[PDB]
Amino acid sequence: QISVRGLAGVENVTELKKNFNRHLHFTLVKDRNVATPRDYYFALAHTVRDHLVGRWIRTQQHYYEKDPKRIYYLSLEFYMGRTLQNTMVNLALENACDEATYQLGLDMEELEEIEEDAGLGNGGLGRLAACFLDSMATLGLAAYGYGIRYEFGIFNQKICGGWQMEEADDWLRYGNPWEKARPEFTLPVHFYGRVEHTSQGAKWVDTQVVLAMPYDTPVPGYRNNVVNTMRLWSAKAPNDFNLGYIQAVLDRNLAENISRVLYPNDNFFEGKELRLKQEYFVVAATLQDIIRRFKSSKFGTNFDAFPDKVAIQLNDTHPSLAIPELMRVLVDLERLDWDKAWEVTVKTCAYTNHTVLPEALERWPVHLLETLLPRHLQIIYEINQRFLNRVAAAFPGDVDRLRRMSLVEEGAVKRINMAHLCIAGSHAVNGVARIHSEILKKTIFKDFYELEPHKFQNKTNGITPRRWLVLCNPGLAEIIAERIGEEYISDLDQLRKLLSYVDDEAFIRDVAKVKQENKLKFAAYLEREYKVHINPNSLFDVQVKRIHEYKRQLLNCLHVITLYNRIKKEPNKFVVPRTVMIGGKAAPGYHMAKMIIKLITAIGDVVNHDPVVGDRLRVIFLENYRVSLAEKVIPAADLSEQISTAGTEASGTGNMKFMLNGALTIGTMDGANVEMAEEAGEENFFIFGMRVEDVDRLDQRGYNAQEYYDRIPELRQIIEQLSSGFFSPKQPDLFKDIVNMLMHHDRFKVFADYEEYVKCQERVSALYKNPREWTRMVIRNIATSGKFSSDRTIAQYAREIWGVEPSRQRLPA
Amino acid sequence: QISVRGLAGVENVTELKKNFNRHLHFTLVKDRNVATPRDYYFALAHTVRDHLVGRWIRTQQHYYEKDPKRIYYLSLEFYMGRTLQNTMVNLALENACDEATYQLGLDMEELEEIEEDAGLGNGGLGRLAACFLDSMATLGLAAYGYGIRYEFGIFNQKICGGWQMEEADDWLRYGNPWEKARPEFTLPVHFYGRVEHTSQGAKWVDTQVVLAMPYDTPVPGYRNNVVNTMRLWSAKAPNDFNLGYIQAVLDRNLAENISRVLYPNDNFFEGKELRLKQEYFVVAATLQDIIRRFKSSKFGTNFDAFPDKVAIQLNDTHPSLAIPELMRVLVDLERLDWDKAWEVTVKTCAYTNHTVLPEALERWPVHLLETLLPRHLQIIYEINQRFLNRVAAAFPGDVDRLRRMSLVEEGAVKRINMAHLCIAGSHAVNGVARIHSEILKKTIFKDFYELEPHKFQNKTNGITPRRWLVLCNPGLAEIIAERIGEEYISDLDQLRKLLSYVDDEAFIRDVAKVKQENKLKFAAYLEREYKVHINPNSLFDVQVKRIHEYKRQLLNCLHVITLYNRIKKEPNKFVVPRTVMIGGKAAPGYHMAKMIIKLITAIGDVVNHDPVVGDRLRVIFLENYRVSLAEKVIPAADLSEQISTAGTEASGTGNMKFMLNGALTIGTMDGANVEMAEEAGEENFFIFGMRVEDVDRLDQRGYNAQEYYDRIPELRQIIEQLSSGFFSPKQPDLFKDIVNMLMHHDRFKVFADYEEYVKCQERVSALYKNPREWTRMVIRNIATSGKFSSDRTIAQYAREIWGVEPSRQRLPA
Numbered sequence A, B: 001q002i003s004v005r006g007l008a009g010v011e012n013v014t015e016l017k018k019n020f021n022r023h024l025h026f027t028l029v030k031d032r033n034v035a036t037p038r039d040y041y042f043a044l045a046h047t048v049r050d051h052l053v054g055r056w057i058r059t060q061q062h063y064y065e066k067d068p069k070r071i072y073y074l075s076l077e078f079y080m081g082r083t084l085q086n087t088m089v090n091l092a093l094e095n096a097c098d099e100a101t102y103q104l105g106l107d108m109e110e111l112e113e114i115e116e117d118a119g120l121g122n123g124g125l126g127r128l129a130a131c132f133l134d135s136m137a138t139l140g141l142a143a144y145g146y147g148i149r150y151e152f153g154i155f156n157q158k159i160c161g162g163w164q165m166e167e168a169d170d171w172l173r174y175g176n177p178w179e180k181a182r183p184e185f186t187l188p189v190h191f192y193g194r195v196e197h198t199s200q201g202a203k204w205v206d207t208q209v210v211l212a213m214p215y216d217t218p219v220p221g222y223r224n225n226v227v228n229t230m231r232l233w234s235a236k237a238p239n240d241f242n243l244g245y246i247q248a249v250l251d252r253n254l255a256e257n258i259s260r261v262l263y264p265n266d267n268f269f270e271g272k273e274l275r276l277k278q279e280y281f282v283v284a285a286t287l288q289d290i291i292r293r294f295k296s297s298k299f300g301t302n303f304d305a306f307p308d309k310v311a312i313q314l315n316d317t318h319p320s321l322a323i324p325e326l327m328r329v330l331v332d333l334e335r336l337d338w339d340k341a342w343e344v345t346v347k348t349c350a351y352t353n354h355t356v357l358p359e360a361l362e363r364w365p366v367h368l369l370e371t372l373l374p375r376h377l378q379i380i381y382e383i384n385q386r387f388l389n390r391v392a393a394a395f396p397g398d399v400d401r402l403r404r405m406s407l408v409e410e411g412a413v414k415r416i417n418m419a420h421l422c423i424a425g426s427h428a429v430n431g432v433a434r435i436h437s438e439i440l441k442k443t444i445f446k447d448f449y450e451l452e453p454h455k456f457q458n459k460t461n462g463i464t465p466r467r468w469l470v471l472c473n474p475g476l477a478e479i480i481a482e483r484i485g486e487e488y489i490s491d492l493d494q495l496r497k498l499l500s501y502v503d504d505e506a507f508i509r510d511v512a513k514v515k516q517e518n519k520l521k522f523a524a525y526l527e528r529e530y531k532v533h534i535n536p537n538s539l540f541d542v543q544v545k546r547i548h549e550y551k552r553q554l555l556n557c558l559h560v561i562t563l564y565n566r567i568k569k570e571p572n573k574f575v576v577p578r579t580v581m582i583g584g585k586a587a588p589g590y591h592m593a594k595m596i597i598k599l600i601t602a603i604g605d606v607v608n609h610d611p612v613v614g615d616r617l618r619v620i621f622l623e624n625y626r627v628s629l630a631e632k633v634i635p636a637a638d639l640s641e642q643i644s645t646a647g648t649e650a651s652g653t654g655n656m657k658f659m660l661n662g663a664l665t666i667g668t669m670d671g672a673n674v675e676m677a678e679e680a681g682e683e684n685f686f687i688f689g690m691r692v693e694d695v696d697r698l699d700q701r702g703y704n705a706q707e708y709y710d711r712i713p714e715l716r717q718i719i720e721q722l723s724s725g726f727f728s729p730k731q732p733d734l735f736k737d738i739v740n741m742l743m744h745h746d747r748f749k750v751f752a753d754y755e756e757y758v759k760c761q762e763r764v765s766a767l768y769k770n771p772r773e774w775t776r777m778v779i780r781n782i783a784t785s786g787k788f789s790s791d792r793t794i795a796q797y798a799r800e801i802w803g804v805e806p807s808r809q810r811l812p813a
């Protein structure tokens, strides 16, 4: 049907049809008479999978022969979503499969919906890893993603009586056609035990062994015939485990619990032993695999060349144990001297920081590490001593600097600061947006920057334009390709060419047409799947992201209520109609976030059923927000809410997705919003509120929320409504915790940005009244979104950190 | 190479080779440069599997169209062994695959050894179920095996310091290419809860739900294009299970533990809750599946026709809960009246008894059933009341009969006798050999036989001649086929034609040649795999079966020591050389059985290293006895030890395997030995010892072991040797428990058969000195082994119990 979806040749369509029928028969053991739609999905997935394997085998053959420097991306999260459409896109197979399935009497889009998300992440950090894998393969890098194969990913969110309920994400129930078990590369991982000292150094003995079994998933590059590997470890008990008899077999579960479930915390540290075990498990298995691959290479014992052949990227501090584990292996097993081992480690490792929120920083109790990983604690103590000796020599007599920079934190319970470990043991430390990287050098890591300034870098985040434009918004990808060709898909900077179409009446009409179609499709999805009705002519106002106080879903709530109250006051006055959509999951133990969800639904209950409002205002909570839902809602959005308190959202990536898909942005000067506004021009963004400097000024004086309550009558009314039980008639005090937080202990200064936010929203409504000028501003956003491709991000990592050159060159097919 | 292995056509070999290469590439994601032997096994298995699916689909299509009466074989054990060679045999593919793999540069026999046994059974009962599935498919019956998919089968046995050690049989580690998950037919199973009474009868409420997910494995008939199904259930927690968050997900393990591990008890009842849950789990899921299939049929609500379309065979009492579960469904859910439901149940169910040992009988505590299955207990009480009302009417005033026949056993703890439940609720009750079925009517079920004589039948056990001749002994199958053709493989009675070859000098030579080749091959296997050396010219004296006091491995031990002591007394006297091989697993909690294993190895330690003995006597313990090992050792055997105390081994099936494979039998008149001797002629068997009647006479008088000790000097010497520490110099009292048992509390009268046993063994040695006459007797055994084909057994079940006609007719290919 459309150009960007590739060719549907007679030869290819015929071959796909017969291979589809082969899999249905031989693989699924079914025929057309008994086959369910799920069977048809699997037949298609196996058919597409077949096209991957030849390229997969020859890519890994190529790496073995050429022996390039290998990039190892270590992450506890890979938020992959669905794989079928992505694979078709990257292989130029979409139209052919569409035709083949059409001729078999099937609707391909219907089959696509059957696939489970691989929801092995929480939000931004996990999705960044997924975008990164796509870009590394597209740029021809010899890259491997290493993580854990969770049996249960992020929970499925159900809303019951307005409250969030969690259920197990049993994503492997029907099987995963994309993965290949590799039980032949199973590796032992050690826990507990004790340290023994001999003539030949230290020995870690009396350990408990858990096996790590790898599962490999292919990662196709965009039309370059490169297929890289994501290798995820699964925990397995050894066969002599605990070996009355029956109980010993049943107790195998204890070891295998390591890879059972993803910790559902977004930007929050929980110091549980099982989490620590997960972190070491991924690190220990991965490092053995890396070293094995290094020794068994065409290069040729000598670890001097280790950093020339290996780069390890730590995604946050979660895999920080890679640093002392590498030291352990090099010193204890390979018998290298400390100084040489340390040189190798530092040159190999690099660390990406994802947040400055104190509650998200990993600080492990010494007593946990003492019991679980006794040798690693000893190594960390030695790292600390040698590091602090360097600090003392650089800043003599500065005793407070010594305590501030220590990897060991003193107190009631001694803790290890994993961020400090990462900085000391890495040759590069990066933040994820310009403002964030500056904040790191000026505030939380100031001491480290003063000691080693060369270590600190910026790498602004990005998103893959394959998943986040071509896949989810084919209508927009096509109208763009009509004007400027297809090269932009792997060179997003080419979107700048669209600036010469801002006055083109044909293009203006097509851009607006694509948005309306997307909105109609999403309005239809909501009715079919959730029996909720919306007006497709209204402004689609959306905030989708994890529920967090710093992200200020509550500020959005205050605006919604302001709009409702203004309508109730002057009912016969015209207002631009809005559909306000808010979605995202709360961590199960995060009480305030659960209360915010309940608030949003409670507002909906009042607003959506008030006859005086009509279809002028609707508030909908988008249930079970996840990658597949993002692919549907983002292309449908008109307004993107990016309203974190300045200085709290390190980068954001949802913001970039909305920009690429034709939504305008209302936001604070926070994270990547700053660079987005810079790229598009401030005139083409809806920027409001305190800057970082204004927040600091308010902190020094002291934030008093009562001041705002006293001086803003519209804000006062809302607080009275919440307190009196207007939004909860049967439980009048339901939201007392929310009011109390807002009035007395609000770390994120919701009230301080309220006035500017509401006024800015008025400007948004004004522009939306003029469709032509709205669309022209939209074109100016899309056209300048090029910087935010993860291809740009990865090229910077490659050149400035990993010391490798990207390549757009095709491998032979 | 050999005729019975089928044709190796140019077309077929070419097609197999290319499909092998396809699977290696697409399925395993490998090439010839990186492939391991395990990869090659899997490529072959997938290639052979492909040939099954077409036949599998059309068989199940055929059953849906013809709607025959369906046979449901319910068992907690299916001792399947390996599947690759069996599938090739039944599909006439062995020579073609042999040729195809040879041309690819691979040895097929080497690849076959890589396959894990499906060890989902303990011994005789589980292996009988496997033979039965093979015969039902071969005889064209619409039959389904239903059981549990254990994650861990029977433990792997390691011998360490002479002691048995157990390790987990992680048979699914590398995957199972033969099974197909069918998550679409997942069914809920209920536990706990309480019974509620309404106007519309009883309701079982507040239950815990566990899901049952089926996995289907194909069961090919011998060259008839029939492929039946074995459906095994796996336990799965529902997604809202226990739904702080992390622990609730981890607690899913509790529900899923139901299908985790096979209880490793052979002929011994252990009253643990997990076992009861397993028993109900298989029954509840299976019955729902049966009823679904019955309702969704081309026949056409009315349960009057249920017994005309359904037969349920209970393999022992393990699935006895089928009786009250069927009543529950019919009465509580379908709203049939009790009397009608009961008629249907009785006409549907039939029960096979496997032993008369009191310790093996299932007697469940009422308090367990009360908590776990409250509705089932109520139904059992009602069944009991109505049954005992019938007894009272038939035998008025006989109050002791009432207590004896009750399903409820009175005492300190009330128990339900599951055997009594089975008899009351089945239209047929059978023993497994003529003597066993007679014992049932005369002793343990005498009261029931008097009430309902028509119910009691015999069905002598059998073995499949596909696995137990063609597969494991191709050399013998071939020399037989040369004379009488190939028809005997599915009509074993044709072996009688071999009686006209007993004086044929060519045949005599070939039979003896096949045995020597088998012995050389097994002697080579022992050296390669266990570094143990044996003399292939010696008599191979073997006892392989589970370790049990009733099976009297201890009597064998006494003979071995007698032979050793006689050699030591007259060293320069000629004795027929023997290799005594004993193998089998002991239940982990069975102390005495573990002591017997240690004794056997301890005798070996003395005998095998005595220079005066030389290579005249060797004692070897065969480690990890299982189906695949049986296939190797049985064709190599000269002498089969079947020496259970008369009246204790219900049938035996190992005995039949040895007879079919050219070993002579030394045994008591017990189980099927009686019918074997009857078939071959007593002159061609080595029968010794007490008959059942002699055992009873000894019991009435009182068994005094001291008498035998006092009157037999050779027996006295052995007991002194055991007591003094001759076989355990460092631990002189190691075997005190064995001696004490033998002298004071021997239920199985080892001493009473000692004299006759030793004398009979002398007669065996005498015959072995004359190779020609040994072989002639062997031919007389093989020729009369026809009755013991499981095809005969299944034909009898079909005609006399299930009311269906067997068919040797081919389905179209």
Ligand SMILES: O=c1[nH]c(=O)n([C@@H]2O[C@H](CO)[C@@H](O)[C@H]2O)c(=O)[nH]1
Binding pocket: A060, A061, A064, A185, A292, A293, A296, B034
């Ligand atoms: O995970 C890995 N998988 C591999 O196949 N290799 C190597 O690639 C070579 C060519 O495919 C193989 O010989 C193997 O050593 C490797 O080092 N790591």
Ligand SMILES: O=c1[nH]c(=O)n([C@@H]2O[C@H](CO)[C@@H](O)[C@H]2O)c(=O)[nH]1
Binding pocket: A034, B060, B061, B064, B185, B292, B293, B296
């Ligand atoms: O386990 C079962 N699998 C099936 O396929 N069937 C039925 O067989 C028919 C023809 O293959 C199907 O329509 C299904 O109803 C069935 O009853 N039980």
